[PDB]
Structure 1
Amino acid sequence: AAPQQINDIVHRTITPLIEQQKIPGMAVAVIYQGKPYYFTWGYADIAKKQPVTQQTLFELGSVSKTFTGVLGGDAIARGEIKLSDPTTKYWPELTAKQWNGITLLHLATYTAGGLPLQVPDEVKSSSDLLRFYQNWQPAWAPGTQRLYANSSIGLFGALAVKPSGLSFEQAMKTRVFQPLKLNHTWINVPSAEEKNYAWGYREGKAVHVSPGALDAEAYGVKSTIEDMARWVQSNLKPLDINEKTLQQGIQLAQSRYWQTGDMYQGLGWEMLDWPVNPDIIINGSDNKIALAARPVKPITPPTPAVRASWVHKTGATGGFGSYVAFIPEKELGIVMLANKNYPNPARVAAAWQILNALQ
């Protein structure tokens, strides 16, 4: 069991959320004074009456970008890449003139100048990808507008692993998942684990995310509530991580590279100063704002990770909705995994109500 205050706020917050949003299955972890407390509701498979458990795998959707950002941070710490490196250093075939001046930093932080939200479904092979990026015309100069984009950070992740000689999946397993003992976190779910893979539900139909180019880097990780609680713990307290470059990569992913309004862009993670205005984070998570182009101000040098921050990331696929938020100064965090893609503001409002009650 958990402290009664945790049980109380979680039951009082999540129960009406599930009823109002018609969520079939949900798992929540609260990290309180560094320790995890787990809660499950509902079904991973409705028709087959399989309950959500602490071993159920959920599609994290864009929460995957936090792993990509940390893996990139680890590569920086290893001396393998620098964020100021030009994109063309790692992909010399990207010869089109618009790529002159676009750095890894711009890719990682969605500031390359209008790379689109999605890689087109028609783009599958590395030859298709090259044609896509060679034909793309920026709307803005690099480093002026943030436009959230799988095609931007997805390319960052693919290029950041090139010096290592490893595939993106192998780099992620060897350099992030394995050192942190994330033993049930997968880019590709093995056959033997399919029994634990929840179905997502979209308009009442059971669905799983479809393959797409750069999916692993941008939205393709599946994980359990236990592994996600450990991921939060690791990002809350990197000084407990023994592998020095991973410790440093976690810190670098919470550095503040750009500001827009009151939010700061990290590597994958986004941050605001704590205490936050809850209306700012709730309303800012609505796709009307979160997917819009917004002007950025550079932070030179990037601010080293600030402990008194609200650090967070939403994620979705067609059938799933996920949210992670944590406050390093308070040793406090939350993971919310659900097998329905329900509106971002409802996730953020519930998470803030829980964490604010426990601060």
Structure 2
Amino acid sequence: IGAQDERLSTLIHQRMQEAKVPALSVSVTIKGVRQRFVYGVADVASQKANTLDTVYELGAMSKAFTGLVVQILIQEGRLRQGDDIITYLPEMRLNYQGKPASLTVADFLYHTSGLPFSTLARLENPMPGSAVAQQLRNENLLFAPGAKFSYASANYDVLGAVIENVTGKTFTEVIAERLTQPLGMSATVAVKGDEIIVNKASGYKLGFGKPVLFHAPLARNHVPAAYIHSTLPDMEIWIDAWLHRKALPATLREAMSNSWRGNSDVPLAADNRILYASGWFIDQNQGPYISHGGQNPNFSSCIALRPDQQIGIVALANMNSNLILQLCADIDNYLRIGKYADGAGDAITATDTLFVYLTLLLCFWGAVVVVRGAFRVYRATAHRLRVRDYIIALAVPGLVAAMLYVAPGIMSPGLDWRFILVWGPSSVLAIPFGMILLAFVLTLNHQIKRILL
């Protein structure tokens, strides 16, 4: 019944400019009164506008969907959170101290399973004939199940496989029949792959200071953790369902109430006593404040609810940015006290900037060697031999490239260049190449500069 808040709009434009995301869509609910902020382009090359129809990957905001469906099957008596995972995924052996470990459904709901960080690299790589249980079989857990909170995205991929086993249905179908169809979220879907979705934003990723179109992987097994697709009107319906459950049938209502119950049975750090529930963080400080970010290789998003004040906040963007991950908290500060802190830092940006300077140094280092060599070749001389000369100068770059290829596997067991390339800036690949190229021209110069008679 009145214009939207211009200080709110200012904040969001500012964070959009700092984030450099091509598209940003935001919706703020405050006791029915909703405000919408829909800016930028969903596709840069074709100048396709960000509209309310624009579809986004939800990232880890997918987990609230998966977790709620788990709580629906629990509420219907088809599952127990105390059930052992082997009852539903019989081939998933997971070891602690060399011995098969008992993992419960609760362990995956609450990230108390022990799966190493590298299970993200396996689940996100498309593997067309491999079930989740095979991709994770014989993984070495970091700690005894239940012993601490340790976030791992693939925990919710295990839960998607449980859903399918319990129902005998595809994950796509269960989400539709249990969530999107009952709630009326007619533009939300769990995808089956990288099939073409009309209205989906193109996804972008920072490279040399600018957003670069990035075609990210979309592995069918990883959809329950990362790849539910939605729109801003559907996410407002999502928000409104969590805030207003009267109109909802009792099984969905009960499941929701059980979905916001955080796991208190883990050690808490001195500066963080926040609990994780069924795909949400639960914070009692200036709360209840229920929240979750969504970080994909080339999408990012955030959601936060303050149900006692009837507040819901969702942001969607087609680039991975920490400024979008934090924007919901910024907007909550704004609604709460009318102020907000400066833009947080961003790992992709800092890394991208570090790599611009590093490849520039390699050019200056390389051009110093080229200009120095042409000055030698022009001022002096110029008036099976070239074989052994071309052999010693070519092994060094090929040997520098050999060590470069294995270095990720060694310094961090479980990760590979494929994973690094998916998540890091577009500029990462110029670091190895400028290195082997420099190591090429350096070895050649010294091999030839020893031929001076």
Q: Deviations over 1:9-49 (max 9, x none)?
A: 32121011111121211111111103433221111111212
Moved over 6 A (4+): 189-193
- The equivalent of 1:313 in structure 2 is 292
Counterpart amino acid of 1:246? L
- The equivalent of 2:103 in structure 1 is 102
Counterpart amino acid of 2:273? D
TM-score, structure 2 as length reference:
0.66
* Secondary structure, aligned partner of 2:236: helix
Q: 1:139 aligns with which of 137, 142, 153?
A: 142
Matches within 5 A, 1:20-35: 20-35=18-33
- Most deviating of 349-358 and 176-185: 349-358
Structure with greater helix percent: 2
Distance in 2 (alpha carbons) for counterparts of 1:122 and 1:30:
35
- The equivalent of 1:297 in structure 2 is none
1:271 equivalent to 2:271? Answer no
- The equivalent of 1:215 in structure 2 is 222
Could you tell me whether the CA contact under 8 Å between 1:86 and 1:100 is conserved in 2?
no
- Larger Rg computed on CA atoms: 2
Distance in 1 (alpha carbons) for counterparts of 2:128 and 2:201:
29
- The equivalent of 2:330 in structure 1 is 350
Distance in 2 (alpha carbons) for counterparts of 1:321 and 1:171:
25
5+ residue gaps, structure 1? 276-307
- The equivalent of 1:118 in structure 2 is 120
Distance in 2 (alpha carbons) for counterparts of 1:209 and 1:237:
36
Counterpart amino acid of 1:46? V
TM-score, structure 1 as length reference:
0.83
Matches within 5 A, 1:71-82: 71-82=69-80
Distance in 1 (alpha carbons) for counterparts of 2:198 and 2:81:
40
Distance in 1 (alpha carbons) for counterparts of 2:282 and 2:320:
23
Q: Deviations over 1:189-214 (max 9, x none)?
A: 99998441111111222234422252
Could you tell me whether the CA contact under 8 Å between 1:68 and 1:217 is conserved in 2?
yes
Could you tell me whether the CA contact under 8 Å between 1:57 and 1:224 is conserved in 2?
yes
Distance in 1 (alpha carbons) for counterparts of 2:158 and 2:85:
9
1:44–1:144 Cα change, 3 Å:
same
Distance in 2 (alpha carbons) for counterparts of 1:127 and 1:323:
31
Counterpart amino acid of 1:263? I
Could you tell me whether the CA contact under 8 Å between 2:194 and 2:218 is conserved in 1?
no
Q: 2:12 aligns with which of 11, 14, 28?
A: 14
1:187 equivalent to 2:197? Answer no
Could you tell me whether the CA contact under 8 Å between 1:72 and 1:161 is conserved in 2?
no
Distance in 1 (alpha carbons) for counterparts of 2:86 and 2:193:
35
- The equivalent of 1:300 in structure 2 is none
Matches within 5 A, 1:45-56: 45-56=43-54
Structure ranking higher on relative contact order (CA contacts 8 Å, 6+ apart): 1
1:119–1:169 Cα change, 3 Å:
farther
Q: 1:328 aligns with which of 301, 304, 307?
A: 307
1:55–1:80 Cα change, 3 Å:
same
Could you tell me whether the CA contact under 8 Å between 2:193 and 2:218 is conserved in 1?
no
Distance in 2 (alpha carbons) for counterparts of 1:37 and 1:240:
23
* Secondary structure, aligned partner of 2:111: coil
5+ residue gaps, structure 2? 339-453
Identical amino acids, percent of aligned pairs: 24
Could you tell me whether the CA contact under 8 Å between 1:264 and 1:270 is conserved in 2?
yes
Instruction: Give the RMSD, CA atoms, in angstroms.
Output: 2.5
1:95–1:75 Cα change, 3 Å:
same
Could you tell me whether the CA contact under 8 Å between 1:119 and 1:213 is conserved in 2?
no
* Secondary structure, aligned partner of 1:64: helix
Could you tell me whether the CA contact under 8 Å between 2:68 and 2:259 is conserved in 1?
yes
